[PDB]
Amino acid sequence: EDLYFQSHMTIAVTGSIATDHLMRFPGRFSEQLLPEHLHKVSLSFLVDDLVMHRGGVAGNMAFAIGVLGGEVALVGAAGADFADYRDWLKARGVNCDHVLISETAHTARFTCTTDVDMAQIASFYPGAMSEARNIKLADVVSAIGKPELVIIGANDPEAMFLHTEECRKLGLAFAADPSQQLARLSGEEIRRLVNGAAYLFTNDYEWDLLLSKTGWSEADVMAQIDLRVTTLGPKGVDLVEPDGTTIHVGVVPETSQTDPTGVGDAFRAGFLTGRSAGLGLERSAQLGSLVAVLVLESTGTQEWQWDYEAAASRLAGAYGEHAAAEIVAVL
Amino acid sequence: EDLYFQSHMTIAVTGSIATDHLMRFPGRFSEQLLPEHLHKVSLSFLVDDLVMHRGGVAGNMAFAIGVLGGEVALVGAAGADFADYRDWLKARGVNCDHVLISETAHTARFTCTTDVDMAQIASFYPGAMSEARNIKLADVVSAIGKPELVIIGANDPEAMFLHTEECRKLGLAFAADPSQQLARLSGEEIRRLVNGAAYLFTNDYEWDLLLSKTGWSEADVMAQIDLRVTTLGPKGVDLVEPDGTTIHVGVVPETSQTDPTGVGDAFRAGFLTGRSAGLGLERSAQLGSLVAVLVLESTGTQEWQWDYEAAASRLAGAYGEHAAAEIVAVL
Ligand SMILES: Nc1nc(F)nc2c1ncn2[C@@H]1O[C@H](CO)[C@@H](O)[C@H]1O
Ligand SMILES: Nc1nc(F)nc2c1ncn2[C@@H]1O[C@H](CO)[C@@H](O)[C@H]1O
């Protein structure tokens, strides 16, 4: 029981802050993935495009929460070059006071290749991100009060656990969002991020990867968390309670599949923004699905716009008049 | 029948010229590749290392032929920054007079991630490489005479076919070495690079990929080429005649598995250098296997050294006293 004052009602977003280099491969990754050679791949894709955008899961989620009008603090480590990115985030209402700025290291670099089917293969060079393990959430809480929720996104692997442990001892609700780091984290490292999570967010691949590396069954997981949120690509999202009562919400139909980078981050930000404003699970995932498709339809993770009227109309089209009115009212 | 004078006995190396960014993932790619999710991967690897080295298959092969004392011309397209790389190559005897230097575009960039098992996943941004389709081999032959062999390595996809067609009409022997570009090339594009090749070089994965995309059987291929050379990783290399009489040569045992980038290029350069000096197929693959392991044991593709005495001793250790003496004498 933490007796310190409530930040009311700020979301703290912890996780990576990066520059993304996004490229396109005009072919199919799967077609190149021979099942008998997956033991030791040798893959090289000639790309026809390369563009740079602001990124990092925490930058992406903070940006979207800010666009949607939420109170949000970004907590992560960046290089000295961060001043410009800070102005871009501040322009959408993001509190960047608690970003650790490295004296020596460079802002992290994401290099990603997307194929015609929206599959993606990418590397992430941490640089200054590794110093996130030096950030104390206690000092953040000291300054702005207790957040209603701390998001634990992909980050310096040690930082992900330290931040989670801090949430546990400070009694802060947290969302486990290890998605992007599941490949790097050992089963032991994944297991210690999960217990007591208000939300666990992944896509279905990541859900299978998590269970595969943790050695856990779905039951083992549901006993430790308040809610599992599993995005299903073109099949929408499952929201599962520990019982588990399952709410399913289908996608907002896309007009293009441009670039899927940051789609999960956007869903999570919209959904959590919905939850913060007292919408239920179904309505929150409907709002999330909209921000998600807006990212899918643009190149880069923070290159989407928010038109209130366009939003209501689209929400109406996919979910009906009730959903659209309840959602738009909350914002 | 080309009546123009013989370059005697120059190898022309066509293919990519690049800067390589090499990174390491301290985990296993396969462990992250769920067979039921290979339909649409979502992969992101946190890397712990990033280093830059001179690269491109044609730069790599030209460098090695030059180190081994061969006469070699590098033929490809690079950016204005190429002046420095040119000095590095010229220092090892490489003729760079026929490199096309782009007035506007940047030297190509390779971004590669290697796991603990030496598996690799990479992207290649062409930049100035795309202008290789503007290079005329006829003009090269005009200047230096007919090469004894033209290597057709991974390149601008259109350039790979144009260069091959030029070899066919100029009556130049050529080696089809599409390896790195097989992922990008259509089955139609692969099929038109093969007929009449003096050598076809691939590893076994690439051999399966080639057959898979061409719709060809091994028999269909062997009827069109003079020799198939298929590297087998830790199992060495198969050299197969159209019959097919098969010569197999095992690896030179490694003291480390440092970085496998450029290992194939090195094998090909050593092997072809062997063939140029009148060694037979077995002896040429033995020399090739040595340059190959030297690359495996160093980081980068052209960061290996050539000690004549160390070479003889290692060749002796893996292949016996006869092989070592016959090989070292030729150089
Ligand atoms: N392995 C990773 N680790 C961390 F901390 N962040 C990563 C990783 N892979 C992708 N990203 C970031 O994810 C964003 C899209 O969700 C992108 O903006 C990108 O910066
Ligand atoms: N898709 C590709 N296309 C081309 F033309 N070149 C590529 C490709 N992938 C890797 N490379 C180069 O291969 C070298 C190692 O064999 C490396 O030095 C690298 O530059």
Side-chain angles (χ1 to χ4, degrees), chain B residues 177-216:
Chain B
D177 182 24
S179 53
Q180 302 290 8
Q181 217 61 282
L182 291 166
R184 173 59 141 82
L185 299 176
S186 69
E188 180 176 50
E189 285 159 358
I190 296 173
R191 283 195 299 271
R192 62 190 195 180
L193 295 177
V194 169
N195 185 51
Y199 303 99
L200 169 71
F201 289 100
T202 67
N203 60 34
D204 35 42
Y205 159 68
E206 288 163 347
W207 175 241
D208 287 355
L209 192 59
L210 181 146
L211 296 173
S212 158
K213 301 177 70 167
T214 53
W216 277 343

mmCIF file of all heavy atoms in Angstrom, chain B residues 177-216:
data_model
loop_
_atom_site.group_PDB
_atom_site.id
_atom_site.type_symbol
_atom_site.label_atom_id
_atom_site.label_comp_id
_atom_site.label_asym_id
_atom_site.label_seq_id
_atom_site.Cartn_x
_atom_site.Cartn_y
_atom_site.Cartn_z
ATOM 1 N N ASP B 177 27.147 -16.958 -59.975
ATOM 2 C CA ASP B 177 27.260 -16.920 -58.509
ATOM 3 C C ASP B 177 26.151 -16.037 -57.932
ATOM 4 O O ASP B 177 26.424 -15.016 -57.290
ATOM 5 C CB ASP B 177 28.651 -16.384 -58.128
ATOM 6 C CG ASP B 177 28.891 -16.354 -56.624
ATOM 7 O OD1 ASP B 177 28.241 -17.122 -55.881
ATOM 8 O OD2 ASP B 177 29.736 -15.543 -56.194
ATOM 9 N N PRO B 178 24.887 -16.423 -58.162
ATOM 10 C CA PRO B 178 23.775 -15.542 -57.779
ATOM 11 C C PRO B 178 23.469 -15.579 -56.281
ATOM 12 O O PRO B 178 22.684 -14.760 -55.820
ATOM 13 C CB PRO B 178 22.596 -16.138 -58.544
ATOM 14 C CG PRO B 178 22.933 -17.645 -58.577
ATOM 15 C CD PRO B 178 24.417 -17.662 -58.824
ATOM 16 N N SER B 179 24.089 -16.513 -55.561
ATOM 17 C CA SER B 179 23.820 -16.764 -54.143
ATOM 18 C C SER B 179 23.039 -15.683 -53.387
ATOM 19 O O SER B 179 21.848 -15.854 -53.116
ATOM 20 C CB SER B 179 25.125 -17.089 -53.416
ATOM 21 O OG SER B 179 26.105 -16.097 -53.651
ATOM 22 N N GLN B 180 23.694 -14.558 -53.099
ATOM 23 C CA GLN B 180 23.112 -13.533 -52.236
ATOM 24 C C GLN B 180 21.822 -12.910 -52.765
ATOM 25 O O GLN B 180 21.078 -12.303 -51.998
ATOM 26 C CB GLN B 180 24.135 -12.415 -51.935
ATOM 27 C CG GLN B 180 25.434 -12.873 -51.269
ATOM 28 C CD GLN B 180 25.241 -13.321 -49.824
ATOM 29 O OE1 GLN B 180 24.108 -13.430 -49.329
ATOM 30 N NE2 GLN B 180 26.355 -13.598 -49.138
ATOM 31 N N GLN B 181 21.553 -13.050 -54.060
ATOM 32 C CA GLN B 181 20.397 -12.393 -54.659
ATOM 33 C C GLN B 181 19.241 -13.350 -54.930
ATOM 34 O O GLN B 181 18.196 -12.936 -55.423
ATOM 35 C CB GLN B 181 20.792 -11.681 -55.961
ATOM 36 C CG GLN B 181 20.054 -10.357 -56.171
ATOM 37 C CD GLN B 181 20.348 -9.366 -55.052
ATOM 38 O OE1 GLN B 181 19.785 -9.464 -53.954
ATOM 39 N NE2 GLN B 181 21.243 -8.405 -55.326
ATOM 40 N N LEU B 182 19.420 -14.624 -54.593
ATOM 41 C CA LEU B 182 18.406 -15.633 -54.912
ATOM 42 C C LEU B 182 17.059 -15.321 -54.270
ATOM 43 O O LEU B 182 16.007 -15.620 -54.845
ATOM 44 C CB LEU B 182 18.883 -17.043 -54.534
ATOM 45 C CG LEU B 182 20.034 -17.561 -55.402
ATOM 46 C CD1 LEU B 182 20.696 -18.775 -54.787
ATOM 47 C CD2 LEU B 182 19.541 -17.879 -56.817
ATOM 48 N N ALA B 183 17.093 -14.709 -53.086
ATOM 49 C CA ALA B 183 15.855 -14.325 -52.409
ATOM 50 C C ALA B 183 15.058 -13.301 -53.208
ATOM 51 O O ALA B 183 13.826 -13.367 -53.255
ATOM 52 C CB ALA B 183 16.147 -13.796 -50.996
ATOM 53 N N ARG B 184 15.752 -12.350 -53.834
ATOM 54 C CA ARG B 184 15.077 -11.283 -54.582
ATOM 55 C C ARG B 184 14.657 -11.701 -55.995
ATOM 56 O O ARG B 184 13.641 -11.236 -56.504
ATOM 57 C CB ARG B 184 15.976 -10.039 -54.642
ATOM 58 C CG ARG B 184 15.490 -8.892 -55.526
ATOM 59 C CD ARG B 184 14.129 -8.353 -55.132
ATOM 60 N NE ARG B 184 14.066 -6.896 -55.254
ATOM 61 C CZ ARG B 184 13.852 -6.243 -56.390
ATOM 62 N NH1 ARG B 184 13.682 -6.918 -57.521
ATOM 63 N NH2 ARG B 184 13.819 -4.917 -56.400
ATOM 64 N N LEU B 185 15.446 -12.572 -56.624
ATOM 65 C CA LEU B 185 15.234 -12.944 -58.030
ATOM 66 C C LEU B 185 14.045 -13.891 -58.211
ATOM 67 O O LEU B 185 13.898 -14.844 -57.445
ATOM 68 C CB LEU B 185 16.495 -13.612 -58.581
ATOM 69 C CG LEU B 185 17.783 -12.781 -58.591
ATOM 70 C CD1 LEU B 185 18.954 -13.611 -59.064
ATOM 71 C CD2 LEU B 185 17.598 -11.566 -59.488
ATOM 72 N N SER B 186 13.214 -13.639 -59.227
ATOM 73 C CA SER B 186 12.142 -14.578 -59.579
ATOM 74 C C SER B 186 12.726 -15.829 -60.235
ATOM 75 O O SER B 186 13.870 -15.816 -60.699
ATOM 76 C CB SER B 186 11.140 -13.929 -60.533
ATOM 77 O OG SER B 186 11.734 -13.706 -61.802
ATOM 78 N N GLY B 187 11.939 -16.905 -60.282
ATOM 79 C CA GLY B 187 12.381 -18.144 -60.903
ATOM 80 C C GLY B 187 12.806 -17.914 -62.345
ATOM 81 O O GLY B 187 13.777 -18.506 -62.831
ATOM 82 N N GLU B 188 12.080 -17.043 -63.032
ATOM 83 C CA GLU B 188 12.429 -16.664 -64.400
ATOM 84 C C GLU B 188 13.793 -15.973 -64.431
ATOM 85 O O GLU B 188 14.632 -16.271 -65.295
ATOM 86 C CB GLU B 188 11.343 -15.746 -64.962
ATOM 87 C CG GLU B 188 11.567 -15.271 -66.385
ATOM 88 C CD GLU B 188 10.393 -14.441 -66.896
ATOM 89 O OE1 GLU B 188 9.971 -13.494 -66.190
ATOM 90 O OE2 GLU B 188 9.881 -14.747 -67.997
ATOM 91 N N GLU B 189 14.014 -15.062 -63.479
ATOM 92 C CA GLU B 189 15.284 -14.335 -63.364
ATOM 93 C C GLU B 189 16.472 -15.236 -63.009
ATOM 94 O O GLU B 189 17.600 -15.008 -63.480
ATOM 95 C CB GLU B 189 15.148 -13.177 -62.358
ATOM 96 C CG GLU B 189 14.366 -12.002 -62.932
ATOM 97 C CD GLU B 189 13.774 -11.073 -61.874
ATOM 98 O OE1 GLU B 189 13.924 -11.344 -60.663
ATOM 99 O OE2 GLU B 189 13.144 -10.064 -62.269
ATOM 100 N N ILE B 190 16.232 -16.247 -62.178
ATOM 101 C CA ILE B 190 17.280 -17.213 -61.876
ATOM 102 C C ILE B 190 17.592 -18.083 -63.108
ATOM 103 O O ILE B 190 18.754 -18.289 -63.461
ATOM 104 C CB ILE B 190 16.913 -18.082 -60.649
ATOM 105 C CG1 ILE B 190 16.807 -17.202 -59.395
ATOM 106 C CG2 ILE B 190 17.956 -19.146 -60.422
ATOM 107 C CD1 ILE B 190 16.277 -17.937 -58.172
ATOM 108 N N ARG B 191 16.557 -18.581 -63.778
ATOM 109 C CA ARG B 191 16.765 -19.497 -64.901
ATOM 110 C C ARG B 191 17.639 -18.940 -66.023
ATOM 111 O O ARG B 191 18.401 -19.675 -66.655
ATOM 112 C CB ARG B 191 15.420 -19.950 -65.475
ATOM 113 C CG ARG B 191 14.716 -21.006 -64.630
ATOM 114 C CD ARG B 191 13.606 -21.673 -65.426
ATOM 115 N NE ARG B 191 12.605 -20.700 -65.840
ATOM 116 C CZ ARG B 191 11.546 -20.375 -65.105
ATOM 117 N NH1 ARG B 191 11.365 -20.951 -63.922
ATOM 118 N NH2 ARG B 191 10.675 -19.476 -65.546
ATOM 119 N N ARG B 192 17.538 -17.639 -66.266
ATOM 120 C CA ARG B 192 18.266 -17.021 -67.372
ATOM 121 C C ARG B 192 19.726 -16.678 -67.040
ATOM 122 O O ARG B 192 20.434 -16.120 -67.879
ATOM 123 C CB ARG B 192 17.516 -15.774 -67.874
ATOM 124 C CG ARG B 192 17.377 -14.658 -66.831
ATOM 125 C CD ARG B 192 16.433 -13.558 -67.308
ATOM 126 N NE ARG B 192 16.593 -12.356 -66.488
ATOM 127 C CZ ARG B 192 15.916 -11.229 -66.658
ATOM 128 N NH1 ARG B 192 15.014 -11.137 -67.629
ATOM 129 N NH2 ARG B 192 16.144 -10.195 -65.853
ATOM 130 N N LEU B 193 20.184 -17.023 -65.837
ATOM 131 C CA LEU B 193 21.565 -16.730 -65.435
ATOM 132 C C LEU B 193 22.433 -17.971 -65.534
ATOM 133 O O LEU B 193 23.649 -17.889 -65.409
ATOM 134 C CB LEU B 193 21.610 -16.245 -63.981
ATOM 135 C CG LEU B 193 20.928 -14.929 -63.647
ATOM 136 C CD1 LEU B 193 21.023 -14.671 -62.143
ATOM 137 C CD2 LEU B 193 21.571 -13.786 -64.421
ATOM 138 N N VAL B 194 21.798 -19.117 -65.779
ATOM 139 C CA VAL B 194 22.456 -20.410 -65.580
ATOM 140 C C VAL B 194 23.062 -21.050 -66.845
ATOM 141 O O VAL B 194 24.198 -21.531 -66.810
ATOM 142 C CB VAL B 194 21.512 -21.394 -64.821
ATOM 143 C CG1 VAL B 194 22.056 -22.815 -64.844
ATOM 144 C CG2 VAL B 194 21.297 -20.910 -63.374
ATOM 145 N N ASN B 195 22.336 -21.018 -67.966
ATOM 146 C CA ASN B 195 22.762 -21.756 -69.168
ATOM 147 C C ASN B 195 24.148 -21.402 -69.673
ATOM 148 O O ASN B 195 24.448 -20.233 -69.941
ATOM 149 C CB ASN B 195 21.760 -21.599 -70.314
ATOM 150 C CG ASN B 195 22.125 -22.457 -71.509
ATOM 151 O OD1 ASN B 195 22.371 -23.657 -71.364
ATOM 152 N ND2 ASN B 195 22.199 -21.845 -72.684
ATOM 153 N N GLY B 196 25.003 -22.418 -69.798
ATOM 154 C CA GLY B 196 26.323 -22.214 -70.376
ATOM 155 C C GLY B 196 27.375 -21.788 -69.367
ATOM 156 O O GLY B 196 28.521 -21.495 -69.735
ATOM 157 N N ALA B 197 26.996 -21.752 -68.093
ATOM 158 C CA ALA B 197 27.935 -21.361 -67.041
ATOM 159 C C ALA B 197 29.079 -22.369 -66.922
ATOM 160 O O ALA B 197 28.838 -23.580 -66.868
ATOM 161 C CB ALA B 197 27.207 -21.221 -65.688
ATOM 162 N N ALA B 198 30.308 -21.863 -66.869
ATOM 163 C CA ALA B 198 31.471 -22.695 -66.583
ATOM 164 C C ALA B 198 31.366 -23.291 -65.183
ATOM 165 O O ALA B 198 31.751 -24.440 -64.951
ATOM 166 C CB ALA B 198 32.753 -21.885 -66.717
ATOM 167 N N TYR B 199 30.866 -22.488 -64.246
ATOM 168 C CA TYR B 199 30.684 -22.929 -62.871
ATOM 169 C C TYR B 199 29.389 -22.345 -62.377
ATOM 170 O O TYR B 199 29.042 -21.211 -62.732
ATOM 171 C CB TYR B 199 31.779 -22.385 -61.946
ATOM 172 C CG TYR B 199 33.206 -22.708 -62.306
ATOM 173 C CD1 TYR B 199 33.988 -21.784 -62.972
ATOM 174 C CD2 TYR B 199 33.784 -23.919 -61.938
ATOM 175 C CE1 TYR B 199 35.295 -22.051 -63.293
ATOM 176 C CE2 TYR B 199 35.103 -24.199 -62.262
ATOM 177 C CZ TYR B 199 35.853 -23.259 -62.937
ATOM 178 O OH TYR B 199 37.165 -23.505 -63.259
ATOM 179 N N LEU B 200 28.665 -23.113 -61.573
ATOM 180 C CA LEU B 200 27.578 -22.572 -60.763
ATOM 181 C C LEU B 200 27.990 -22.748 -59.299
ATOM 182 O O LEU B 200 28.298 -23.872 -58.876
ATOM 183 C CB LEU B 200 26.246 -23.297 -61.024
ATOM 184 C CG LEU B 200 25.125 -22.956 -60.031
ATOM 185 C CD1 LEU B 200 24.626 -21.531 -60.243
ATOM 186 C CD2 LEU B 200 23.958 -23.949 -60.112
ATOM 187 N N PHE B 201 28.029 -21.645 -58.543
ATOM 188 C CA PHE B 201 28.419 -21.679 -57.134
ATOM 189 C C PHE B 201 27.202 -21.360 -56.268
ATOM 190 O O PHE B 201 26.510 -20.378 -56.535
ATOM 191 C CB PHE B 201 29.481 -20.615 -56.829
ATOM 192 C CG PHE B 201 30.855 -20.890 -57.405
ATOM 193 C CD1 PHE B 201 31.276 -20.263 -58.573
ATOM 194 C CD2 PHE B 201 31.751 -21.724 -56.743
ATOM 195 C CE1 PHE B 201 32.551 -20.490 -59.101
ATOM 196 C CE2 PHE B 201 33.029 -21.955 -57.256
ATOM 197 C CZ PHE B 201 33.433 -21.338 -58.442
ATOM 198 N N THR B 202 26.947 -22.174 -55.236
ATOM 199 C CA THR B 202 25.950 -21.871 -54.192
ATOM 200 C C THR B 202 26.320 -22.654 -52.934
ATOM 201 O O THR B 202 27.178 -23.540 -52.981
ATOM 202 C CB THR B 202 24.525 -22.396 -54.515
ATOM 203 O OG1 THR B 202 24.538 -23.829 -54.509
ATOM 204 C CG2 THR B 202 23.994 -21.896 -55.863
ATOM 205 N N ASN B 203 25.656 -22.358 -51.821
ATOM 206 C CA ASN B 203 25.631 -23.319 -50.719
ATOM 207 C C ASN B 203 24.384 -24.211 -50.851
ATOM 208 O O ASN B 203 23.594 -24.046 -51.781
ATOM 209 C CB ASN B 203 25.749 -22.643 -49.349
ATOM 210 C CG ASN B 203 24.623 -21.667 -49.061
ATOM 211 O OD1 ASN B 203 23.479 -21.868 -49.467
ATOM 212 N ND2 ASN B 203 24.940 -20.614 -48.320
ATOM 213 N N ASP B 204 24.204 -25.169 -49.949
ATOM 214 C CA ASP B 204 23.142 -26.157 -50.138
ATOM 215 C C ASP B 204 21.755 -25.545 -49.976
ATOM 216 O O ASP B 204 20.815 -25.936 -50.674
ATOM 217 C CB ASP B 204 23.331 -27.301 -49.159
ATOM 218 C CG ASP B 204 23.880 -26.824 -47.850
ATOM 219 O OD1 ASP B 204 23.407 -25.764 -47.370
ATOM 220 O OD2 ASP B 204 24.793 -27.490 -47.317
ATOM 221 N N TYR B 205 21.623 -24.588 -49.057
ATOM 222 C CA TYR B 205 20.351 -23.896 -48.881
ATOM 223 C C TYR B 205 19.969 -23.222 -50.193
ATOM 224 O O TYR B 205 18.867 -23.414 -50.723
ATOM 225 C CB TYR B 205 20.438 -22.848 -47.762
ATOM 226 C CG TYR B 205 19.365 -21.771 -47.858
ATOM 227 C CD1 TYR B 205 18.024 -22.069 -47.638
ATOM 228 C CD2 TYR B 205 19.698 -20.454 -48.167
ATOM 229 C CE1 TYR B 205 17.053 -21.095 -47.724
ATOM 230 C CE2 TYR B 205 18.730 -19.473 -48.258
ATOM 231 C CZ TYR B 205 17.413 -19.795 -48.036
ATOM 232 O OH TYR B 205 16.450 -18.815 -48.128
ATOM 233 N N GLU B 206 20.909 -22.443 -50.713
ATOM 234 C CA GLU B 206 20.721 -21.734 -51.968
ATOM 235 C C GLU B 206 20.447 -22.682 -53.125
ATOM 236 O O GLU B 206 19.669 -22.358 -54.009
ATOM 237 C CB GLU B 206 21.943 -20.868 -52.254
ATOM 238 C CG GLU B 206 22.011 -19.659 -51.339
ATOM 239 C CD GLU B 206 23.380 -19.027 -51.305
ATOM 240 O OE1 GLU B 206 24.345 -19.665 -51.786
ATOM 241 O OE2 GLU B 206 23.489 -17.887 -50.793
ATOM 242 N N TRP B 207 21.088 -23.846 -53.120
ATOM 243 C CA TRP B 207 20.838 -24.849 -54.156
ATOM 244 C C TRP B 207 19.374 -25.298 -54.112
ATOM 245 O O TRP B 207 18.705 -25.369 -55.152
ATOM 246 C CB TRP B 207 21.814 -26.022 -54.006
ATOM 247 C CG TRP B 207 21.585 -27.186 -54.945
ATOM 248 C CD1 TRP B 207 21.287 -28.475 -54.592
ATOM 249 C CD2 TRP B 207 21.650 -27.172 -56.383
ATOM 250 N NE1 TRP B 207 21.157 -29.260 -55.717
ATOM 251 C CE2 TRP B 207 21.373 -28.486 -56.828
ATOM 252 C CE3 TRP B 207 21.911 -26.179 -57.337
ATOM 253 C CZ2 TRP B 207 21.350 -28.829 -58.185
ATOM 254 C CZ3 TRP B 207 21.887 -26.524 -58.687
ATOM 255 C CH2 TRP B 207 21.608 -27.837 -59.096
ATOM 256 N N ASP B 208 18.868 -25.568 -52.908
ATOM 257 C CA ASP B 208 17.456 -25.914 -52.732
ATOM 258 C C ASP B 208 16.521 -24.776 -53.099
ATOM 259 O O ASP B 208 15.479 -24.989 -53.729
ATOM 260 C CB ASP B 208 17.178 -26.388 -51.303
ATOM 261 C CG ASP B 208 17.725 -27.772 -51.041
ATOM 262 O OD1 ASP B 208 18.232 -28.405 -51.997
ATOM 263 O OD2 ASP B 208 17.645 -28.233 -49.885
ATOM 264 N N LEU B 209 16.889 -23.564 -52.703
ATOM 265 C CA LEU B 209 16.103 -22.390 -53.061
ATOM 266 C C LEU B 209 16.045 -22.237 -54.581
ATOM 267 O O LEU B 209 14.980 -22.011 -55.146
ATOM 268 C CB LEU B 209 16.709 -21.132 -52.423
ATOM 269 C CG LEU B 209 15.849 -19.871 -52.462
ATOM 270 C CD1 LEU B 209 14.540 -20.115 -51.755
ATOM 271 C CD2 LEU B 209 16.590 -18.692 -51.837
ATOM 272 N N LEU B 210 17.197 -22.369 -55.235
ATOM 273 C CA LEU B 210 17.276 -22.247 -56.690
ATOM 274 C C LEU B 210 16.348 -23.255 -57.359
ATOM 275 O O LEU B 210 15.542 -22.892 -58.216
ATOM 276 C CB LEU B 210 18.714 -22.454 -57.166
ATOM 277 C CG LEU B 210 18.986 -22.330 -58.675
ATOM 278 C CD1 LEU B 210 20.374 -21.745 -58.895
ATOM 279 C CD2 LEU B 210 18.870 -23.676 -59.405
ATOM 280 N N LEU B 211 16.467 -24.520 -56.966
ATOM 281 C CA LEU B 211 15.649 -25.569 -57.566
ATOM 282 C C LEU B 211 14.170 -25.317 -57.265
ATOM 283 O O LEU B 211 13.304 -25.513 -58.123
ATOM 284 C CB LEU B 211 16.090 -26.953 -57.069
ATOM 285 C CG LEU B 211 17.508 -27.389 -57.459
ATOM 286 C CD1 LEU B 211 17.905 -28.703 -56.771
ATOM 287 C CD2 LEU B 211 17.648 -27.503 -58.974
ATOM 288 N N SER B 212 13.893 -24.859 -56.051
ATOM 289 C CA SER B 212 12.525 -24.559 -55.630
ATOM 290 C C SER B 212 11.882 -23.433 -56.439
ATOM 291 O O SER B 212 10.704 -23.510 -56.803
ATOM 292 C CB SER B 212 12.491 -24.239 -54.127
ATOM 293 O OG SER B 212 11.351 -23.477 -53.768
ATOM 294 N N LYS B 213 12.649 -22.389 -56.734
ATOM 295 C CA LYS B 213 12.099 -21.254 -57.470
ATOM 296 C C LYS B 213 12.164 -21.436 -59.003
ATOM 297 O O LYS B 213 11.282 -20.957 -59.719
ATOM 298 C CB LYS B 213 12.755 -19.938 -57.023
ATOM 299 C CG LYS B 213 12.578 -19.628 -55.527
ATOM 300 C CD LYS B 213 13.297 -18.349 -55.107
ATOM 301 C CE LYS B 213 12.634 -17.121 -55.682
ATOM 302 N NZ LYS B 213 13.153 -15.892 -55.015
ATOM 303 N N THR B 214 13.184 -22.134 -59.502
ATOM 304 C CA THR B 214 13.301 -22.376 -60.947
ATOM 305 C C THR B 214 12.299 -23.415 -61.453
ATOM 306 O O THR B 214 11.906 -23.391 -62.625
ATOM 307 C CB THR B 214 14.697 -22.869 -61.350
ATOM 308 O OG1 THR B 214 15.055 -24.008 -60.551
ATOM 309 C CG2 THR B 214 15.733 -21.755 -61.180
ATOM 310 N N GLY B 215 11.905 -24.330 -60.569
ATOM 311 C CA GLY B 215 11.051 -25.447 -60.944
ATOM 312 C C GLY B 215 11.883 -26.530 -61.596
ATOM 313 O O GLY B 215 11.364 -27.531 -62.088
ATOM 314 N N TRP B 216 13.195 -26.319 -61.587
ATOM 315 C CA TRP B 216 14.140 -27.252 -62.177
ATOM 316 C C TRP B 216 14.489 -28.418 -61.270
ATOM 317 O O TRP B 216 14.443 -28.315 -60.039
ATOM 318 C CB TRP B 216 15.439 -26.528 -62.529
ATOM 319 C CG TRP B 216 15.382 -25.827 -63.824
ATOM 320 C CD1 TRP B 216 14.473 -26.022 -64.825
ATOM 321 C CD2 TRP B 216 16.275 -24.807 -64.278
ATOM 322 N NE1 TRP B 216 14.752 -25.185 -65.877
ATOM 323 C CE2 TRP B 216 15.853 -24.428 -65.565
ATOM 324 C CE3 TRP B 216 17.394 -24.179 -63.720
ATOM 325 C CZ2 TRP B 216 16.510 -23.447 -66.308
ATOM 326 C CZ3 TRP B 216 18.041 -23.200 -64.457
ATOM 327 C CH2 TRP B 216 17.601 -22.850 -65.739
#
